[PDB]
Design a protein around this ligand. Structure first.
Ligand code: FS8
Ligand code: BOG
Length: 333
């Protein structure tokens, strides 16, 4: 076992192996803070995430386990991958802290697009390619948005925070539809791509109701065929007593855009999620012919999400997470 050194960083303590040097705060999220570090074994800059209160509750404990399991499973160029996982603890009894190490990207899409058609083409292409891979493990992201997309200087992109604002969320989510298909994520890609080409948030709702009014404005109120599929009297009545809008012409909306990007946006931003282009299909659209290679667009090994339906004790989630830490086998490059 390596030796750790301790350090106070923004009210939080950081205890990490000595192989990781020059720790400096990049920022903090909902469930952890992330530091930039140097990795003396590789000469590379890494991202080190310390989990905040990983076992505070049963849902936190299960959330901690979930993140570790997801991260150990992803082996793809366009999805965040695990370099290292460590804890300063010598035993299970000690176990109370988790640190995760990934490649340091240097920015998120928020930071870089605030683009040119070729930039957009390349970024969306890579998003779609990582999604194809995630979707193939029967994993749904559910919160794709620019702040979840890590991009470096070479314009290479990795999807972060993937599996389980409202500006990017599919309409079937803000209505709390029971279940979702994978193409909830295609909607979000539609919204991101739109923003990249225009400079503006496609649907900047003030809330879930406003948000929805903006979507139906671009896309049109659902017709009887989509209405056939809505059980909820609540949901269905609102829509039916609503101000019937027609579907706008996208050519008009996105005046100036590559028409091949206008066409893809048209196939992504369908209200009926059964009618949305999938990630596979999108990769083969004409907009991406200069990046698209069928034989370099991989799918994932089967992902066991059975733990998700299980209701266990904190100590059980904590101990499962520990097993995951200990069995971690690094990537060779
Ligand atoms: O993604 C899951 N877990 C997870 C997430 C992360 N998150 C990361 C990583 C890298 C980066 C960012 C966020 C943020 C964008 C960004 C901005 C500035 C920057 O450098 C600026 C500074 O000036 C350097 O010079 C670097 C980066 C960056 O590179 C890190 C480790 C993890 F483990 C997960 C997966 C599944 C389920 C739950 C969670
Ligand atoms: C009010 C505007 C939003 C209504 C249209 C969103 C419906 C999305 O589409 C629906 O998604 C469901 C999964 O969530 C599928 O099971 C349905 O087959 C599909 O029609």
């Amino acid at each position: 076992r390596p030796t750790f050194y301790r350090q106070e960083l923004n009210k939080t303590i950081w205890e990490v192996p000595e192989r990781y040097q020059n720790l400096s705060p990049v920022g903090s999220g909902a469930y952890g803070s992330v530091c930039a570090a140097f990795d003396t074994k590789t000469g590379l800059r890494v991202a080190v995430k310390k989990l905040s209160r990983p076992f505070q509750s049963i849902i936190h404990a299960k959330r901690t386990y979930r993140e570790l399991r997801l991260l150990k499973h992803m082996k793809h160029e366009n999805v965040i991958g695990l370099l290292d996982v460590f804890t300063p603890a010598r035993s299970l009894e000690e176990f109370n802290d988790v640190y995760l190490v990934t490649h340091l990207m240097g920015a998120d899409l928020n930071n870089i697009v605030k683009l040119t058609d070729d930039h957009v083409q390349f970024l969306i292409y890579q998003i779609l390619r990582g999604l194809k891979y995630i979707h193939s493990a029967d994993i749904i992201h559910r919160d794709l948005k620019p702040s979840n997309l890590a991009v470096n200087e070479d314009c290479e992109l990795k999807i972060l925070d993937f599996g389980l604002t409202r500006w990017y969320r599919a309409p079937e989510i803000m209505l709390n539809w029971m279940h979702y298909n994978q193409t909830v994520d295609i909607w979000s890609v539609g919204c991101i791509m739109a923003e990249l080409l225009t400079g503006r948030t496609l649907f900047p709702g003030t809330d879930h109701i406003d948000q929805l009014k903006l979507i139906l404005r671009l896309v049109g109120t659902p017709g009887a065929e989509l209405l056939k599929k809505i059980s909820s009297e609540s949901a269905r009545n609102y829509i039916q007593s609503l101000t019937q809008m027609p579907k706008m012409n996208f050519a008009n909306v996105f005046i100036g855009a590559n028409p091949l990007a206008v066409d893809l946006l048209e196939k992504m931003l369908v209200l009926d999620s059964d009618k949305r282009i999938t990630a596979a299909q999108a990769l083969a659209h004409a907009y991406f012919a200069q990046y698209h290679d069928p034989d370099d667009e991989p799918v994932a090994d089967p992902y066991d999400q059975s733990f998700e339906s299980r209701d266990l004790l904190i100590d059980e989630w904590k101990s499962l997470t520990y097993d995951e830490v200990i069995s971690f086998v690094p990537p060779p490059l």
